[PDB]
C-alpha cells in the first residue's frame with residue numbers, strides 16, 4: 371500500500387461519485403488530517419479556479435498529474451468541448467489520476483500522457499491534434515519548469531496570450547524559471563501569494579519521569 375493508493379481509496383469510500391467538488395474535499399481532508407501530500411491544496415486551488423474562470427481556456431496542458439487533484443480542479447471548470455492534457459512520468463501516478471478522474475466523472479475532458487514531459491512535448495501537435503495551448507499548469511519537478519517552458523516555445527506550442535501558471539515558486543522554489551520569466555520581455559508576470567498545502571504539522575513533547583534503577 372502506497373500513500374497515493376490510500377488517497378484514492380479514501381476518495382472512493384467517502385466522496386460522492388460524479389461530484390468533483392466532493393472528490394477535492396475528500397483529498398483535502400485526508401491530506402490535512404492523515405498524511406501530507408504534494409497536492410496544490412484548497413488555498414492555491416482557489417487562485418487556480420479564479421484564473422481558469424478568467425481565461426476560459428479551451429486547451430490546457432498540465433505538467434505533473436500526481437494524484438489528479440489539480441486535473442479534477444481544472445477539468446471541473448472547463449467549458450463543454452474544452453480539453454485538459456496532463457503529462458505524468460510515473461505510471462503509478464498516471465493510474466491513480468485516471469481513476470480519480472473516472473470517479474469524479476471528468477474522464478471525457480482529460481487525456482493522460484504517460485511519459486516524461488521532455489519526450490512528450492515534441493509529440494503533442496502530431497499525436498494529440500494540438501495547435502497552440504491556451505494555458506499551461508506547471509507543478510512537476512521544479513528543475514523542469516524552465517527547460518520545459520523553453521521546449522514549449524521551441525515546439526511552437528505558445529501563442530500570444532498563452533497563460534503559464536506555476537506552482538511552488540516560493541517553496542520549494544523554482545528559481546531559474548522565476549528569474550527567467552520575470553526577466554524576459556516575452557512574458558508578463560503576476561505573483562499570487564498564498565500558502566503551502568497542508569502545513570498544520572503535529573509535534574509534541576514527551577514527559578518521562580525517572581523512577582530509579
Ligand SMILES: O=C(NC/C=C/[C@H]1O[C@@H](Sc2ccncc2)[C@H](O)[C@@H]1O)c1cc([N+](=O)[O-])cc(O)c1O
Nearest residue numbers: 408434435436457458459460463486487509510511
Ligand atoms: O516536489 C513537488 N512536486 C513534484 C511533482 C511531481 C509530479 O509530477 C511527476 S514528475 C514529472 C517529470 C516529467 N514529466 C512529467 C512529470 C511526479 O511523478 C509527480 O506526479 C512538490 C513539493 C512540495 N513540497 O513542499 O515539498 C510541494 C509541492 O506543491 C510540490 O508540487
Ligand SMILES: [Mg+2]
Nearest residue numbers: 410509537538
Ligand atoms: Mg506543487
